[PDB]
């Protein structure tokens, strides 16, 4: 198979497809709540900038490398999304996946409207994000963490990027929910993730697909996503303050 890795069995069917325990029932909740979030910046020592974001069942680690050699008059912004194989219900092929490339492009087309590349001619910035565990909305964590890492790496930006996520209930009276989990995401019909700049009040990225076809529900999904991105800001406000207070006092 692969001549650069250790070869095992050619085929391997996971026991979930043989799992005789029937799918359980998620439950119910209040759709006006947010999972408590703990954020830490400046984690890695060998990285120019890093941040670790954890909320409920989500664990994502992002690191930012400094400018390197090689629209110039402007610098590029390379991105790379990759999730740990021991994440989710099943295993994943190490070489890659189309979903990862889709999330990488959804990251690149969302973090460029924030940094000002007109200050790094002929240079480039590289951002790497890793998902240790998938326990809910993922693209709402690869944006917050990769934006905290950039601000902590001493690059000049217009503002931060704060993300959120939503999902649609499958009942006869569907209602959008805030911060869904895997028990509330695999039983859903549609999902939406927004990227709002809290001060400039400008939407950076939008993505959504599903079974909701009336152009009056998506207005609410968008504006409650904006309210979520306006409610996640203070925690990220005190995280970079603590990061700089600790980093500066070490000199």
């Amino acid at each position: 198979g692969d001549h650069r890795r250790i070869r095992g069995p050619e085929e391997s069917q996971p026991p979930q497809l043989y799992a005789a325990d029937e799918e359980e029932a998620p439950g119910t909740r209040d759709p006006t709540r947010l999972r408590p979030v703990y954020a830490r910046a400046g984690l890695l020592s060998q990285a120019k900038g890093s941040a670790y974001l954890e909320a409920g069942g989500t664990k994502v680690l992002c690191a930012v490398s400094g400018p390197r050699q090689a629209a110039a008059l402007r610098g590029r912004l390379l991105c790379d999304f990759r999730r740990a194989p021991f994440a989710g219900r099943r295993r994943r092929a190490p070489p890659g996946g189309c979903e990862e490339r889709e999330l990488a492009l959804a990251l690149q087309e969302a973090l460029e409207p924030a940094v000002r590349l007109g200050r790094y001619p002929r240079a480039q910035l590289e951002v790497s994000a890793l998902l240790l565990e998938d326990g809910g909305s993922a693209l709402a964590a690869a944006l917050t963490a990769a934006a905290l890492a950039l601000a902590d790496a001493g690059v000049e930006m217009y503002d931060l990027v704060v993300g959120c996520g939503l999902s649609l209930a499958p009942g006869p009276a569907p209602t959008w929910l805030l911060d869904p989990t895997r028990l509330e995401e695999e039983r859903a019909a549609a999902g939406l993730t927004v990227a709002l700049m809290p001060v400039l009040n400008q939407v950076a990225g939008l993505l959504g697909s599903g079974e909701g076809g009336l152009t009056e529900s998506w207005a609410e999904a968008v504006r409650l996503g904006l309210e979520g991105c306006q409610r996640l800001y203070p925690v990220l406000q005190q995280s970079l303050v603590r990061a700089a207070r600790r980093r500066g006092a070490a000199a």
Partner: protein, 66 residues
């Protein structure tokens, strides 16, 4: 919008790694292991000609070209 308290995995991931007598004995350094220079003037204090400056002031002052 309440921020929360960490848990084991995070509080171990964020670790800062920063004479008191003698231990681990065999691993000390003592147990495991003329110059007449006649040096020249030590620096060259540039007290002298520095040609670029020469040719510039030379031609500017001279200003004859004949």
């Amino acid at each position: 919008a309440l921020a929360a308290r960490p848990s084991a995995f995070a509080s171990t991931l964020c670790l800062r790694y920063p004479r008191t007598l003698d231990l681990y004995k065999t691993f000390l350094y003592s147990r495991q292991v003329e110059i007449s220079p006649l040096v020249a003037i030590t620096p060259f204090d540039f007290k002298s000609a520095s040609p670029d400056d020469i040719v510039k002031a030379n031609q500017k002052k001279a200003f004859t070209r004949e």
